[PDB]
Amino acid sequence: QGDPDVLRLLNEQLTSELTAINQYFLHSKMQDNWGFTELAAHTRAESFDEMRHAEEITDRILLLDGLPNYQRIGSLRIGQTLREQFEADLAIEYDVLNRLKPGIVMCREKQDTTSAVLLEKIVADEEEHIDYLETQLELMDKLGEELYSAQCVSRPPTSAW
Amino acid sequence: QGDPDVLRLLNEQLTSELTAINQYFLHSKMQDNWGFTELAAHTRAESFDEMRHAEEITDRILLLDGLPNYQRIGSLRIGQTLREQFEADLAIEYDVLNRLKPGIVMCREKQDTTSAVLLEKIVADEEEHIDYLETQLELMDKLGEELYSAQCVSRPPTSAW
Amino acid sequence: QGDPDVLRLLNEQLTSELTAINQYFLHSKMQDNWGFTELAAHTRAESFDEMRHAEEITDRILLLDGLPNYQRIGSLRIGQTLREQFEADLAIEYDVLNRLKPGIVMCREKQDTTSAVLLEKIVADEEEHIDYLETQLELMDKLGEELYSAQCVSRPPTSAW
Amino acid sequence: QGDPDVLRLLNEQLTSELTAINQYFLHSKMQDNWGFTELAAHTRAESFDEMRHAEEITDRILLLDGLPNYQRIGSLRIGQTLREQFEADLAIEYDVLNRLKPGIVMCREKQDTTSAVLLEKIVADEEEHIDYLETQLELMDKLGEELYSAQCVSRPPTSAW
Amino acid sequence: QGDPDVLRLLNEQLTSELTAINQYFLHSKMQDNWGFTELAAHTRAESFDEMRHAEEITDRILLLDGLPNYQRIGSLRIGQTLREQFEADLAIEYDVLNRLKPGIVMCREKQDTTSAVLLEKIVADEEEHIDYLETQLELMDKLGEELYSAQCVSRPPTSAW
Amino acid sequence: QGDPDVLRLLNEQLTSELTAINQYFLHSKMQDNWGFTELAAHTRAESFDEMRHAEEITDRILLLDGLPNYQRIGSLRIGQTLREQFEADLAIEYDVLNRLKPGIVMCREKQDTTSAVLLEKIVADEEEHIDYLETQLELMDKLGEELYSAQCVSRPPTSAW
Amino acid sequence: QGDPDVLRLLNEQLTSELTAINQYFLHSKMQDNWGFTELAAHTRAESFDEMRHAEEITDRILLLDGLPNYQRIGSLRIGQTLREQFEADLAIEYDVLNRLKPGIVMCREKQDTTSAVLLEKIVADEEEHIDYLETQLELMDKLGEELYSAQCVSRPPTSAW
Ligand SMILES: [Fe+3]
Ligand SMILES: [Fe+3]
Ligand SMILES: [Fe+3]
Ligand SMILES: [Fe+3]
Ligand SMILES: [Fe+3]
Ligand SMILES: [Fe+3]
Ligand SMILES: [Fe+3]
Ligand SMILES: [Fe+3]
Ligand SMILES: [Fe+3]
Ligand SMILES: [Fe+3]
Ligand SMILES: [Fe+3]
Ligand SMILES: [Fe+3]
Ligand SMILES: [Fe+3]
Ligand SMILES: [Fe+3]
């Protein structure tokens, strides 16, 4: 099993997943720590969702006789404000699309449809998340940073613990 | 209404399904009768899964105004030891892959995506079964035949009746 | 070990069952596909019943140290109308009675009563089905083909989907 | 009154049942006492099966106005190893088939079908036990004695008490 | 079509059933009327038991393209005391055995096992009812008629109302 | 290892149990067959009671490294009337007392209290069964045999079927 | 007040129990610690059983105005392998039988039956355990040490934590 070009694509996406997991998780802990507890819970969920992706890819790789790469993490764009965090996470998302769109076509050319369908679902998921992040940035401009941030705390406001 | 080439492909796969069902079911009966009753349940489930594929393909053929071929069987490979059975069953699965991979691409070129999607699912499924069979053969080597077989009996060993 | 003439008879019946299963299942899919969904469900159950028979004969053969023949199918007679299907299915059934009636007598001469009882039960089942099939034909003449067929669709008429 | 020859056959089979009951029960206790507790439970069950057979024969005999023989026990052959026990038990099962096969034919010649059916059912039951026993012997050769034996103990191994 | 000789035998037995049904039912009404209400309930059930037999035979006859005879009835022998009733009912039962024993052998000679099995089951049933009747007569002699009769009443004694 | 004298005594008692089991069970089938269905259920239970005794002794013998004797059976005395049956069963019981009383004292002399306690419990049980049997015989004389027998039937009387 | 020789015997047994409790509990912790967690659980229950015995003897002593000796322990024999542990635990057990058997006889001579019955029950318990221990050693020889040990671990193997 396992076409070297497909395996390499899968492993590169896996590296991207482990990056997203760490980045998203930390951001959610920071949001929590700042008092934005309502938002933190949401961001945390996205993190576990990438975990699910990572596992799905790991499985595909193992089935294909490859060795999953758990050694390499990508760069970490840690935001110091809500807006920076949204933008940072958006940036990871666009890169996934840039890589997976052409990747899918190749998988099908290489006659590996199972890998292709896997990546098609991930694209579908990522498009939704990208939309969510872009909508939040639009909301910040429409409402104002303070007003938007107030919708991110509880009543009364709390902290990480 | 359905493309003649797509229909010949579906009928080829259908024939392959009927062959697999008989082979898998008989193997399950033999394993059962040999005393390997735990394993036999697993193989039995596999033949019922193939029946489900046979029905799905039949549906597709009929919808395309084709005639499902229920007259033709391929050559059964009956193993006379556990290892032979895993290897015989493995042989059918690869043929399935070798056939359906070019077939899916063809179906999409003919713009029949519903038939392509049906075969995409079947391929996904067979890959999981191949991995299962290939793994059983690996375990026989790692554990040794006798030790592996002891894991396929109940406590205490039964008989099948 | 089982007597060779008994095993041959058992295997001949097994070939008959596999044929019947295919014929009946295909007929039920066709009936379903024509819109006769109420009838289709009934014919489906008949093919699963022949499955039950196939497994029982397989067990008996295996117990007698025989090798169950799953490689050979008989000739399918596929009907292109309801009446034809009833007549085609009836042809298999009379065929079984013709084979089994002398067969039982012989099984008992060879002092294999357990095989005899198995075949006695199958004969009893087939007589009931033959009666069913003959009654449907009788009803088609009495009601008329149209009126009869109307009793085989749901309200409102539906399809395989 | 019953035919004296049928009555003599029934009493003869009754003696065989009483023998098998003793032999099977003792073996089960010995297996229990050796540490083979999972196997013991199975052999104990077979012992109560023969008890039911013994009762049914007693009934038939009484109905036929004869005297059931509870005075005579056959020759017990008691195994000192598992393999010996399977062989000893199999030996007695073969005698049954040898006595009952011609016996049934004659019952029917004597026009006593109720007695014949009772014996037909017994033959059916013993063929399944013969198969179970022969399969165990076959498993001992395939797995080895120790490995097979270990499938007959509990985890952890225990004792009769 | 059934064999004409088998059909004749079946209709003879049916005539016997209808006779037994009327006789047993009337005897039970008379026993009830005399005050023997406990016994009457038992005899009534025997009467419905023959009804079931009558229906089974009717069914078989119709499946064989025969015409069930519901016009001919046998001669009732109606007892005027408990003992006479038992002796009268026993007389029908023996006639059933005298006719069915040879009948079964013939049915099997004609290739009709289903009719034979039906009759085998009836012989088994009547054998049990004969035993019951014979046992009651033995009890009357052991207990004396007065003492036996007292076991057939309720506490306190009642009537058909 | 148990003391050889204790082992001999245990096997003697076991032989007695097996004799009692057969005799009591047959007597109960005969009582049932005669119509004495209420009494039969009682005798049947006594028979299973001795089975429990037989198993306890077997267990003790095996724990002491002995070989249980399941080959030797005593002489059955089978009664042809109720009174004979009670007298026949009572005769076994007295023999048990005659053997076990001295037996217990010896067991304690040999340092084997567990075997002694087992036998003490059996003596207690048989003493109660002797009382039951002796009481039934006294009742036959007080009531008369006919009147006593009437207490052993159901209302209304039935049979073994 | 209790007899001085009885009290001494009771206290000697109490010292035996405290020793056994320690030895068995430590063995179970060691077995648990080696990975034989299934076996460990069984050995633990045995030490709690000896606790039960220790308390009963304490009660009896106190009732007889004695002073229970909780200051003295016997010599622990700690095994460094499974087989050694079984043999070490067996050594204590034969020791108890040797002490208790003559002891009981004496208790009864001193006319202290309640103390005698207490010791009779302990002897009965120990015989069962001795059988258990002897059977495990017997099974180690039959299966082999490795195969036997494998039956003492969970799936998958685990540890004391
Ligand atoms: Fe992603
Ligand atoms: Fe995402
Ligand atoms: Fe498939
Ligand atoms: Fe599959
Ligand atoms: Fe059939
Ligand atoms: Fe059918
Ligand atoms: Fe038997
Ligand atoms: Fe058996
Ligand atoms: Fe009848
Ligand atoms: Fe009747
Ligand atoms: Fe007893
Ligand atoms: Fe008793
Ligand atoms: Fe103790
Ligand atoms: Fe203990």
Numbering used by the authors:
A (entry chain E), B (entry chain C), C (entry chain D), D (entry chain B), E (entry chain A), F (entry chain A), ...: 2 to 162
What does the paper say about this structure?
Safe iron storage, detoxification and appropriate delivery of iron for biosynthetic functions in a cell are carried out by a superfamily of proteins known as ferritins that are widely found in all domains of life. A subfamily of ferritin superfamily found in eubacteria, called bacterioferritins (Bfrs), differ from ferritins in having additional noncovalently bound haem groups. The Mtb genome reveals the presence of two putative iron-storage proteins, namely, BfrA (Rv1876)–a bacterioferritin and BfrB (Rv3841)–a ferritin like protein. The structure of Mtb SeMet-BfrA exhibits the highly conserved architecture of ferritin superfamily where the complete biological molecule is assembled into an almost spherical shell by the symmetrical association of 24 equivalent monomers that are related by operation of 4-, 3- and 2-fold symmetry axes.
We have determined the crystal structure of selenomethionyl analog of bacterioferritin A (SeMet-BfrA) from M. tuberculosis and carried out in-depth analysis to identify sub regions of structure unique to Mycobacterium species. The crystal structure of Mtb SeMet-BfrA has been determined by Molecular Replacement (MR) using the structure of the recently published M. smegmatis BfrA as template and refined to a final Rwork value of 19% and an Rfree value of 23% at 2.5 Å resolution. The crystal structure of SeMet-BfrA additionally demonstrates that SeMet incorporation changes the electronic environment in the haem-binding pocket of the protein leading to demetallation and cleavage of haem ligand. Moreover, the circumference of the horse-shoe shaped electron density ring appearing at the documented haem position in the SeMet-BfrA structure was larger than expected for the haem porphyrin ring and appeared broken between two five-membered pyrroles strongly suggesting the presence of a metal-free and degraded porphyrin derivative. On further exploring the shape of the electron density, the break in the density advocated that the porphyrin ring is cleaved at its γ-meso carbon position, resulting probabaly in the generation of biliverdin IX-γ isomer as the main end product. Moreover, since the mass spectrometry analysis of Mtb native and SeMet-BfrA crystals was unable to provide a clear evidence about the presence of biliverdin as the haem degradation product, this ligand has been designated as ‘unknown ligand’ (UNL) in the deposited PDB. The best temperature factors and Rfree value were obtained when iron was refined with 0.3 occupancy in both Fe1 and Fe2 sites. A close examination of the di-iron site in our crystal structure reveals that this structure is compatible with the reduced form of bacterioferritin. A pore, termed the B-site, is large enough to accommodate an iron atom and is lined mostly with negatively charged residues Asn34, Asp66, Asp132, Glu135, Thr136 and Glu139 and hence maybe the most likely route for iron entry/exit to/from the Bfr cavity.
